[PDB]
């Protein structure tokens, strides 16, 4: 409706991806690996892939075993376009593995002239004692990729992924990672002068 609910909590940004610069006009998408922090565009399309280091993001790729639910908020920003010209759309696909057979977990579709945001939440549940080691070949466990696609990559400028841990979350086991490259936030206005 015309009033908006109070939407609280802390939802630190984790993964952000921008659409290829002009004159790329074909339909293109990107896949987010919500649990390991790895972004990958469709083909050799030029996207701007950035992985941040929120306290939350960190734990995800440094914790071997994890169990609980995750809250997510996906934001879509677009480059200024005369409203009555917008034909963009966004098809977000939540899935367990990109292997062509595996069917979507959840499925969304939205056409918001300008920019919108959609919050959803999946459940990380595993075979051990309720834990699912992100993509371990043990019980042939999966992960959670969230594939987002853009109709017109020119009107849709970027996909932002924000995620918050739900209090019922628990993890045990450390996975030795390589040093984490310092990645700062680029949204402040691109101000020079």
């Amino acid at each position: 409706g015309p009033v908006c609910a109070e939407a609280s909590d802390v939802y630190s940004p984790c993964m952000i991806a921008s659409t290829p610069p002009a004159p790329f006009s074909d339909v293109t998408a990107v896949t987010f690996d919500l649990i390991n922090g790895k972004i990958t565009p469709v083909g050799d399309d030029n996207w701007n892939t950035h992985i941040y280091n929120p306290p939350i993001m960190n734990v995800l790729r440094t914790a071997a075993w994890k169990s609980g639910t995750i809250h997510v908020q996906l934001n879509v920003r677009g480059a200024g376009v005369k409203r009555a010209d917008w034909d963009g759309q966004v098809f977000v696909y939540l899935r367990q593995s990109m292997n062509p057979e595996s069917y979507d977990a959840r499925t969304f579709v939205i056409s918001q002239p300008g920019s919108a945001m959609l919050n959803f939440s999946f459940d990380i549940i595993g075979p051990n004692s309720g834990f699912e080691f992100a993509e371990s070949p043990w019980a042939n466990q999966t992960t959670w990729y969230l594939e987002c696609v853009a109709t017109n990559p020119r009107q849709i400028q970027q996909f932002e992924v924000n995620m918050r841990f739900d209090p019922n979350f628990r993890v045990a086991g450390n996975i030795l990672m390589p040093p984490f490259p310092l990645s700062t936030e680029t949204p402040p206005l691109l101000k020079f002068r």
Partner: protein, 369 residues
């Protein structure tokens, strides 16, 4: 005579029990260089692979048991002359991905074991390969790719005549395997972090020496253009501020020849290096007998007025810092009849009566030590 076979002592599912002889399922030989100041990787290898060659009483039963019920006891053997120091470490971790950091701070977040072959001859402990269950199989740690490691934390204070080796006695002892899971409960009876604090280095001479360690262990530890962090440390970063009883395990990695008296205490940053009256603040004085290797430091709630920020911004002046620091001051002066350094391993093992305050938005990287 003949007999029915479908019902025989053949469908046995029970875990291996017995003496440490029928329990020994692996013996790995790991060598040491005649010289290795620090950060050397003595031997890295997937846990399950430690059995490859092996063929002991327990070996065979180890692989063929679907569900093991006991922890693994790893025992290292290795002694060096009284006049020489050194520090090793064996640490297991649930998994690994890509070009990982082999540094100390990275591996000792999970079950680890540290020691000095100079004063304590053979070291051993028991761990649980399945950090969130109470069971685990041979095929288990093979698939979930459980990696174990061995590193040298501090060089030899003096070089041995030849290269040496330390043996390992992998056994499946009779102890219940218990899980170690992290909750988000703001108030926790006890929370383990095993976050390393640093390799303190005190040069000989009457030089006035002092070291500070950030009690703002948020985000992780330092590294050029990037921070590395284990799961625990990375996790506590979940909260903005925090507090609780601090526990610490300070190890001596130098030859017992290098004698020196160090004093610890909690104080703030603005403190001058030429202060001197640290001894007026509540403290603990630490000396080391010719053999004593470990010394536990406990700092009760009374040493902190209020909770403090988990992690503070890197570009923060040392005087603008408002969060406590664990101090390590030389009381008298390091010394010895042999050239060498008095190294000290400081590891924050856990927080008793932890208290996490509000969710932390985050802040990229962290101070570098």
């Amino acid at each position: 005579m003949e007999q029915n076979l479908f019902a025989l002592s053949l469908d046995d599912t029970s875990s291996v029990r017995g003496s440490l002889l029928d329990t020994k399922f692996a013996q790995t030989r790991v060598l040491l260089s005649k010289a290795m100041a620090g950060g050397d990787v003595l031997l890295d290898e997937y846990l399950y692979d430690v059995v490859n060659g092996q063929d002991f009483r327990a070996t065979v039963a180890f692989l063929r048991t679907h569900v093991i019920t006991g922890k693994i006891k790893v025992t290292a053997t290795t002694n060096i002359s009284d006049n020489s120091g050194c520090c090793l470490m064996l640490a297991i971790n649930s998994g690994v991905r890509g070009k990982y950091s082999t540094d100390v701070y990275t591996i000792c977040s999970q079950d680890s074991m540290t020691w000095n072959p100079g004063c304590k001859k053979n070291f051993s402990f028991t761990f649980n390969p399945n950090p969130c269950g109470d069971s685990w199989s041979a095929e288990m740690i093979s698939r979930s790719r459980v990696r174990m490691t061995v590193i040298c934390v501090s060089g030899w204070t003096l070089s041995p005549t030849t290269d040496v080796i330390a043996k390992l006695d992998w056994s499946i002892v009779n102890e219940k395997c218990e899980p170690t899971i992290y909750h988000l409960a703001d108030c926790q009876n006890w929370l383990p972090l095993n976050r390393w604090m640093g390799k303190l280095t005190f040069p000989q001479g009457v030089t006035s020496e002092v070291r500070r360690m950030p009690l703002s262990i948020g985000g992780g530890a330092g590294a050029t253009q990037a921070f590395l962090a284990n799961m625990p440390n990375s996790w506590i970063s979940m909260w903005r501020y925090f507090r609780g009883e601090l526990h610490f395990e300070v190890t001596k990695m130098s030859s017992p020849y290098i004698k020196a008296t160090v004093t610890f205490l909690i104080a703030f940053g603005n403190l001058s290096d030429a202060f001197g009256f640290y001894e007026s603040f509540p403290h603990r004085i630490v000396q080391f007998a010719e053999v004593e290797e470990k010394c536990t430091l406990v700092f009760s709630q009374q040493e902190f007025v209020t909770a403090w920020s988990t992690q503070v911004n890197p570009r923060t002046t040392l005087e603008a810092d408002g969060c406590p620091y664990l101090y390590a001051i030389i009381h008298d002066s390091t010394t010895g009849t042999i050239s060498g350094d008095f190294n000290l391993g400081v590891k924050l093992v856990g927080i008793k009566d932890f208290c996490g305050i509000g969710s932390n938005p985050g802040i990229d990287g962290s101070r570098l030590l």
